[PDB]
Design a protein around this ligand. Structure first.
Ligand SMILES: NS(=O)(=O)c1ccc(O)c(NC(=O)NCCCCO)c1
Ligand SMILES: [Zn+2]
Length: 257
């Protein structure tokens, strides 16, 4: 099974998923001086007021919060996107130490963690069909730095002890994802891929310029999760990030000067 260890980690994934060496893989390093301001880019429209969270789950590579995506309840529109994208889930990637953990980098700088809010294009009817299309998904990526606590994250942090090991899930209703967003919605955007297998090249990436701050106690609770299932030798869930991939024939655009 793929993972993040020495023998099954990102350098091995191409053997089962040859698209890993493809033309639009993610994440990438965002060279801020080389990104081009695009004045035709529209502001992002984040409409999360009716979001309905369902469950929180340890899937063996991250933890995720899942939402009801059977109606237009929490949607992303505007920005570089055509049409309406429904929120399906969010999850995080993080490090063993505060100087690594993000997937995207900014001028080679790594953040302590990265939040991915995953949305799919409603014209394709379901996420399984959307992943087969070059414009099927939109992932909003948000960097986390360590400093002051993020109050909107605490409800997530406090339930992690109930999903310590792979396969465990818990009810997680009435969570408001608006509490995870920074003040500014300025962003970079480029066409890319899922950052975990199957590495499908279906994602419009929207990476926010402004990080959110979380406390050392909050990130320490992420690092207490386990990759392994219950009853197996304990391997802490840390460093579940893919390194930056070649930009190849792509340009990163900025919404801001
Ligand atoms: N990190 S990401 O680019 O935001 C991302 C967003 C949505 C996804 O569905 C995946 N990939 C995934 O969940 N794979 C699960 C194992 C099944 C493979 O057989 C990654
Ligand atoms: Zn992710």
């Amino acid at each position: 099974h793929w993972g993040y260890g020495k023998h099954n980690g990102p350098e091995h994934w191409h053997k089962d998923f040859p698209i890993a060496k493809g033309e639009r893989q993610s994440p990438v390093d965002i060279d801020t001086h080389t990104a081009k301001y695009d004045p035709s880019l529209k502001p992002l429209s984040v409409s999360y007021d009716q979001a309905t969270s369902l469950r929180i789950l340890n899937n063996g590579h991250s933890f995720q919060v899942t939402f009801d995506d059977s109606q237009d309840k929490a949607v992303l529109k505007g920005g570089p996107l055509d049409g309406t994208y429904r929120l399906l889930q969010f999850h995080f990637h993080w490090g063993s130490l505060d100087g690594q953990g993000s997937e995207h980098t900014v001028d080679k700088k790594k953040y302590a963690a990265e939040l991915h809010l995953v949305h799919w294009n409603t014209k394709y009817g379901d996420v399984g069909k959307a992943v087969q299309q070059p414009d099927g998904l939109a992932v909003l990526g948000i960097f986390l730095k360590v400093g002051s606590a993020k109050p909107g994250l605490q409800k997530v942090v406090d339930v992690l002890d109930s999903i310590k090991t792979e396969g465990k899930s818990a009810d997680f209703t009435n969570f408001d994802p608006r509490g995870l967003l920074p003040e500014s919605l300025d962003y970079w955007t480029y066409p890319g891929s899922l950052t975990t297998p199957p590495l499908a090249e279906c994602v419009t990436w929207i990476v926010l310029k402004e990080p959110i701050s979380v406390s050392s106690e909050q990130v320490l609770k992420f690092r207490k999760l386990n990759f392994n299932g219950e009853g197996e030798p304990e391997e802490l869930m840390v460093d579940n990030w893919r390194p930056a991939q070649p930009l190849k024939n792509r340009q990163i655009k900025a919404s801001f000067k």
